[PDB]
Amino acid sequence: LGLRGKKALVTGGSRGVGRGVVLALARAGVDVFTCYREESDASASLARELKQLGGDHHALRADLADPKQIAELFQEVGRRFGTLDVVVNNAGVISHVPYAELPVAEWQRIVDVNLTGAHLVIQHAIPLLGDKGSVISIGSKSSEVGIPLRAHYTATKHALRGLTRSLAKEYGRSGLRFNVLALGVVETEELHALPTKFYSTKTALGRLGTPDEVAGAVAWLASDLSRYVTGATIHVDGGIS
Amino acid sequence: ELGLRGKKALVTGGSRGVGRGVVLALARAGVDVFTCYREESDASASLARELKQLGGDHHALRADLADPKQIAELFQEVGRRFGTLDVVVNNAGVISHVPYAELPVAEWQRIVDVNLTGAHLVIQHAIPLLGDKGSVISIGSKSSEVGIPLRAHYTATKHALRGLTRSLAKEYGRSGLRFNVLALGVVAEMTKFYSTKTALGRLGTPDEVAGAVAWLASDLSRYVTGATIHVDGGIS
Amino acid sequence: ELELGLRGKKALVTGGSRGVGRGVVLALARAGVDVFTCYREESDASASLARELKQLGGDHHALRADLADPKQIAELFQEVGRRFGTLDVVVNNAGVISHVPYAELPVAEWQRIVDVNLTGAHLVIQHAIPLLGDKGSVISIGSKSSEVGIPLRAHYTATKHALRGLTRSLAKEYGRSGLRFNVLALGVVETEAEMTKFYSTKTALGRLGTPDEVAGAVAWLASDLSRYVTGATIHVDGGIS
Amino acid sequence: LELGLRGKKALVTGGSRGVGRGVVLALARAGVDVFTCYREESDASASLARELKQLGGDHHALRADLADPKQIAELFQEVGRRFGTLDVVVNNAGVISHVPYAELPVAEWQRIVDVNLTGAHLVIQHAIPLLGDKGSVISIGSKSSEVGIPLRAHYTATKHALRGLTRSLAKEYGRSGLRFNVLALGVVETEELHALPDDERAEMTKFYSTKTALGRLGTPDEVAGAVAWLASDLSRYVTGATIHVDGGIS
Numbered sequence A: 001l002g003l004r005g006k007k008a009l010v011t012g013g014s015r016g017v018g019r020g021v022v023l024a025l026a027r028a029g030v031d032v033f034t035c036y037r038e039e040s041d042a043s044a045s046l047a048r049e050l051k052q053l054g055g056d057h058h059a060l061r062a063d064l065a066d067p068k069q070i071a072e073l074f075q076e077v078g079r080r081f082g083t084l085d086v087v088v089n090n091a092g093v094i095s096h097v098p099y100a101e102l103p104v105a106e107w108q109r110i111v112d113v114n115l116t117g118a119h120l121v122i123q124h125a126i127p128l129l130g131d132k133g134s135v136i137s138i139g140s141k142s143s144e145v146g147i148p149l150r151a152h153y154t155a156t157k158h159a160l161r162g163l164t165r166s167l168a169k170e171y172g173r174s175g176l177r178f179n180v181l182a183l184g185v186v187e188t189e190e191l192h193a194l195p196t197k198f199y200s201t202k203t204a205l206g207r208l209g210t211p212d213e214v215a216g217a218v219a220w221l222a223s224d225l226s227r228y229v230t231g232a233t234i235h236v237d238g239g240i241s
Numbered sequence B: 001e002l003g004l005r006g007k008k009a010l011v012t013g014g015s016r017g018v019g020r021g022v023v024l025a026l027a028r029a030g031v032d033v034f035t036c037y038r039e040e041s042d043a044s045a046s047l048a049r050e051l052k053q054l055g056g057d058h059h060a061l062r063a064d065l066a067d068p069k070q071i072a073e074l075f076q077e078v079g080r081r082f083g084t085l086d087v088v089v090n091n092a093g094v095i096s097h098v099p100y101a102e103l104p105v106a107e108w109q110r111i112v113d114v115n116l117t118g119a120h121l122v123i124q125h126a127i128p129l130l131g132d133k134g135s136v137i138s139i140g141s142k143s144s145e146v147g148i149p150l151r152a153h154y155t156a157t158k159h160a161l162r163g164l165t166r167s168l169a170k171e172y173g174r175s176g177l178r179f180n181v182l183a184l185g186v187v188a189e190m191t192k193f194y195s196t197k198t199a200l201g202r203l204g205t206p207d208e209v210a211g212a213v214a215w216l217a218s219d220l221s222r223y224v225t226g227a228t229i230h231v232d233g234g235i236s
Numbered sequence C: 001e002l003e004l005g006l007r008g009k010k011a012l013v014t015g016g017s018r019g020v021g022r023g024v025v026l027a028l029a030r031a032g033v034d035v036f037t038c039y040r041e042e043s044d045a046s047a048s049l050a051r052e053l054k055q056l057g058g059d060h061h062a063l064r065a066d067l068a069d070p071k072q073i074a075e076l077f078q079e080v081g082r083r084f085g086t087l088d089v090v091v092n093n094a095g096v097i098s099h100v101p102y103a104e105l106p107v108a109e110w111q112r113i114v115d116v117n118l119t120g121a122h123l124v125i126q127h128a129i130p131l132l133g134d135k136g137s138v139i140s141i142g143s144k145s146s147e148v149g150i151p152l153r154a155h156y157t158a159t160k161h162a163l164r165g166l167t168r169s170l171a172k173e174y175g176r177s178g179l180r181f182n183v184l185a186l187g188v189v190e191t192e193a194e195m196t197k198f199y200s201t202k203t204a205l206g207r208l209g210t211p212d213e214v215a216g217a218v219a220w221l222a223s224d225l226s227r228y229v230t231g232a233t234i235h236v237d238g239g240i241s
Numbered sequence D: 001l002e003l004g005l006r007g008k009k010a011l012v013t014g015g016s017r018g019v020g021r022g023v024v025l026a027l028a029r030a031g032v033d034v035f036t037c038y039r040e041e042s043d044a045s046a047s048l049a050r051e052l053k054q055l056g057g058d059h060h061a062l063r064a065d066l067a068d069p070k071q072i073a074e075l076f077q078e079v080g081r082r083f084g085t086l087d088v089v090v091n092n093a094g095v096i097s098h099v100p101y102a103e104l105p106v107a108e109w110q111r112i113v114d115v116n117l118t119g120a121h122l123v124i125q126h127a128i129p130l131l132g133d134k135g136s137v138i139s140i141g142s143k144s145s146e147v148g149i150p151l152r153a154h155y156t157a158t159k160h161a162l163r164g165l166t167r168s169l170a171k172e173y174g175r176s177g178l179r180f181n182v183l184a185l186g187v188v189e190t191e192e193l194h195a196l197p198d199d200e201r202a203e204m205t206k207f208y209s210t211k212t213a214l215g216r217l218g219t220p221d222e223v224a225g226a227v228a229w230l231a232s233d234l235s236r237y238v239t240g241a242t243i244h245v246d247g248g249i250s
């Protein structure tokens, strides 16, 4: 595996899947740079824990819907890190709106964060990945299945597959690998609600996913054990539907 | 058979290429065809004439699909001239060959605004006009599965059309609306580079696209929704 | 020019006495296609089929032939050669299924599902290729379920998925010879209360399929309107899960 | 984040040559007790047994023609008798041939079906009682089964069948602690290296590297990297999936 000493950027790592991937990479000895949109309890506790671990980690506010802020985020990634080994496009948004009522600004918001943001993050990171780098984008199985009231979400998550596939062709001989992780249903802040079975019935394993299991796949794509894996969609979904 | 005669269709980007073939083939079959283009050209003037000469209630207006209010205007005129729609064909799209590291954000936005947001807005405006029964066809690409250097922004948008279509299929299926994607292949030291990749050894023609479009517009495909139909000659 | 142009063609449809095959056979026949069909055992289904084909005047033939036996596939095609001489359309529709727990699946039941669904489909195609000549459309009946997975039926989905891998190489091999090969991925189709609503909830259209809806797709693939379609998996499944 | 592979017990079919030999040796060097099989006594099988002996611990290599259900029963008598338990199964044994489809004799179709599809099915069916409440079943597939290749339709039919088998088995046994996945391989250099050279000096290598994104063929050890992950608890939520280890070939 050999992750110790690498430098990784993980967008949207203050909550859920991003927070699990960030903390798991850090405990493995990866220098993890992460970002978030707004100062909240989650990012404050995230910085607190990142400091409690031994490593060169950073957590900065950056709204990926604003290309200016992506440029500033990568200014200080190159300032503090200088290089990157792993980029993990994980930041994303979602909303449940009937399609006929979906406002143009909410369509544009989901496109700007989930798709244009991941693209700009990748584009800025290409110079800093160098001779060798692994780019991982978080997709979802739902874009193959289709879910009502979230056509704008599945549109963006499926676009990441088309983006990754062409990028893998373009930069393969440069030593850069691009892949997508197709996620099932991962338990995140369902703990904030009160009474899961609806989705567990759809899985083959009979349980929802955990952010650390996504981290297990991210760690493999970060590792040289996957050095011949590029342009692929890796399903980490428990065989759902 | 297909039973297309009399139905009403909107085909975006019908002045040239694949769109012009679909528009002209649907018109000759007795379909009232409403099409649009981005800029007044010899192709759009030639198109407007050939349409005006057929026994048909055909229309061709200018509408830049990267401008949401030109799309809203386009559908005000479709609603006045047609009142209703049976089939919509998201064909308008753009492509450019740019080294990814050199791709400016504006050219990225242009491909997204036309290929992705445009198709979404056209669909969103057309749903009221389709009523209780309709068939929405979006033009995709086999290249979004293969990957093509210098065109990651293009394959991003064309693959987005599949994720959109799959969710719209499930949202509007019980309302009588069907949503599908046509994955197209390549439509002489260039013809044969692509012919060698095909199973049939030849490039496609717009009228063969019209053959699939016609099937998806008919009740013969009434149980087909949320699908990606490959019209690519088995390429790659 | 936007017409199917099926009148006068010659078609072979395997397993045409019940279910999807019977619907495809009768729909092609009513459209003026001379239909050759087969079945495994003399029943009233086959007797009803022959009586109705006689009532729809045309050069139709319905013979007994067990596709699990390569000797009877060979003779079926001697009869096809005698009576038709040529073929325009082939529909690999015949297939068997059983619900057996995978650990208790006997070798003979596995082998019979393989013999009929896969080896039989392959022998039908191998025998039919000479009869198709310069131009022909081969259609194999697949299933959407082989992408989803169904417990107690891993042998069924194994064979129905194998038809896709066979079809795709066959399209590459014979494309320049004027032969097209495709698969119809079927959803749940009404044939021979709780199950109807159980599967209808999984569709996008909220209803199960009809054999005539399959025939609508077969009709397209048999037509010149699909002359550039080959090596494809066409889904006729109502958007099922 | 660790592969906890030391001490596990694996069965890798067809381990004397090529990809399976790379997977056997890589797993054995990692502290996995590896059971493997082969069809005929060759110098490849003897070389494998000797190199396994230079390692530890107890690896086993036994002849078993998987076109014969009786010899698969023999193989699993010896596995349950020397191991008693399995943690990983890799369906790697496979055959291929170039026959013009119109010339393809029925016995050659049946041979490819017997080894690539029925053989793997019997191996999985015999291995389930030994995998218990936790196990990982990996089947070696091919990217070529979705691109299509002339003169090999019988091969791509069987390699694509493995995906349909795997997906339904994942649904059926997922709640029992068993996971099932496919590794779709690209062009992996094996002893391609003997049908040298000009035929091989860049005719084969260059034609296939042009199709890849990385511009190079795969090695058995890179396949072993994927087999390692799927055998590990880092992939405990990965089941019913087709993992592409193909260098982006298309």
Ligand SMILES: NC(=O)C1=CN([C@@H]2O[C@H](COP(=O)(O)OP(=O)(O)OC[C@H]3O[C@@H](n4cnc5c(N)ncnc54)[C@H](OP(=O)(O)O)[C@@H]3O)[C@@H](O)[C@H]2O)C=CC1
Pocket (backbone or CB within 6 Å): A011, A012, A013, A014, A015, A016, A017, A018, A035, A036, A037, A038, A039, A040, A042, A062, A063, A064, A065, A090, A091, A092, A093, A113, A138, A139, A140, A141, A157, A183, A184, A185, A186, A187, A188
């Ligand atoms: N939850 C699930 O079931 C699964 C998730 N996914 C995908 O995994 C990824 C993680 O999502 P998930 O964990 O579920 O939800 P999150 O709770 O993680 O919410 C979004 C995360 O990304 C950040 N974020 C949102 N918008 C921005 C923005 N403009 N700029 C920077 N950061 C932003 C958020 O930071 P902040 O706190 O400041 O808002 C937050 O950390 C998503 O892409 C999702 O599509 C798909 C299938 C399984």
Ligand SMILES: NC(=O)C1=CN([C@@H]2O[C@H](COP(=O)(O)OP(=O)(O)OC[C@H]3O[C@@H](n4cnc5c(N)ncnc54)[C@H](OP(=O)(O)O)[C@@H]3O)[C@@H](O)[C@H]2O)C=CC1
Pocket (backbone or CB within 6 Å): D013, D014, D015, D016, D017, D018, D019, D020, D037, D038, D039, D040, D041, D042, D044, D064, D065, D066, D067, D091, D092, D093, D094, D095, D115, D140, D141, D142, D143, D144, D159, D185, D186, D187, D188, D189, D190
């Ligand atoms: N480029 C590639 O290598 C590709 C690999 N694959 C798949 O990887 C797997 C192995 O590929 P490869 O490394 O080339 O294997 P090889 O063709 O080089 O050798 C096959 C192995 O399987 C053994 N084996 C055990 N039982 C049998 C049996 N009944 N019949 C035949 N062989 C048996 C063989 O033993 P023996 O020494 O007696 O022959 C041999 O060790 C195959 O399933 C293949 O489909 C998929 C895509 C591409």
